Amino acid sequence: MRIKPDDNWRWYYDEEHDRMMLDLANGMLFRSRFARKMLTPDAFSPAGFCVDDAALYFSFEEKCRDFNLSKEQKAELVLNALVAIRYLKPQMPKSWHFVSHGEMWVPMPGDAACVWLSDTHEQVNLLVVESGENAALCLLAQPCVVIAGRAMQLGDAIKIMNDRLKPQ
Amino acid sequence: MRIKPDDNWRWYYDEEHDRMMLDLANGMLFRSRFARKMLTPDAFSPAGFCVDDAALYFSFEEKCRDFNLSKEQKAELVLNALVAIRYLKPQMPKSWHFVSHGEMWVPMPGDAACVWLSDTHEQVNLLVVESGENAALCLLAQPCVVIAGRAMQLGDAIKIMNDRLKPQ
């Protein structure tokens, strides 16, 4: 495997570029997708990467093996998922942008999900990171997409309603 | 191999942390050893990692395979070499901190070199990154050392006189 979690990793908030980061260490850094706006007040205090984060990392890594992405992309995808799980504030679920399915499906963390955009009918691929019973928090699991007016790229968060999500 | 140069790599200087970086991309960043003080005015303008850089990367990587280091440390070593070659200002060669050898040897870029410290006789490993006929730019190729009063760690530049350098 390409990157392997190590005792030396540190989460820290970068004041100047306004983004959660991981120190890798050894000259390497990972700048996540998430800025102050989206972090819980935990985030603002450096913390070691712990066994629990290691564990989530290993599961996510395997759950993503078969997504259609560069192994560099899979890494960024899984590292943002840890940031989201650990530090993201609660999200306001989105509904009406996506083709609705008459049944609700229970989606588990680590699942590959599609939604359909209700105007373009373009399929978009997500990774599920957190469940709920109405809403599921997902990360965008493809290089980019345009949603409301907004553009988003790989790693970006969005809470979607379970009736809009579907297995790949 | 693990890190592979990619069209999306960008050199840029980071105003806020005063260091030359490389964007890797995919969330990954590399922070080199080198601050404003040591850069040619080129540095202050972002630039794609180009085919020539890619070439230097590949020879330096191979010339460092058998150094006594972590593959993470070899990565940091080589990346700093690239910064050094591309962007470092001319250096003032040092002389007197190192055990002299009555003959001058010709050292090629890419070479593994030792200097001896003249008071401790401790051996220190370097990586040659530029040649000249008197002076040869080297990066420190071991985790850390103490030289004049200064500390230095892996990736740090110093220009040394060729009579002071010796092959591994």
Author numbering:
A (entry chain A), B (entry chain B): 1 to 168
Task: Reproduce passages from the article.
ZapC has been discovered as a non-essential regulator of FtsZ. It localises to the septal ring and deletion of zapC leads to a mild phenotype, while overexpression inhibits cell division. ZapC interacts with FtsZ and its intracellular localisation is only dependent on FtsZ and none of the other downstream divisome components. ZapC has no clear homologues of known function, it is 180 residues long in E. coli and is found across gammaproteobacterial species.
Phasing, automated and manual model building, and refinement produced an atomic model of very good quality, resolving residues 1–168 of ZapC, with two molecules in the asymmetric unit, at 2.9 Å resolution. The dimer interface buries a contact area of approximately 1500 Å2 (out of 8900 Å2 of each monomer). The concentrations of monomeric and dimeric species can be calculated by integrating the baseline-separated distributions, giving an estimate for the dissociation constant of approximately 30 μM for the monomer–dimer equilibrium. Given that L22 was mutated to proline, we think it is very likely that this change disrupts folding in this region of the protein as prolines do not support regular beta sheet formation and the side chain of L22 points into the hydrophobic core of the N-terminal domain. To investigate this conflicting evidence, we probed the direct interaction of a peptide derived from the C-terminal tail of FtsZ with ZapC by ITC (isothermal titration calorimetry) and obtained a KD of 32 μM, as expected for binding of a short, flexible peptide.
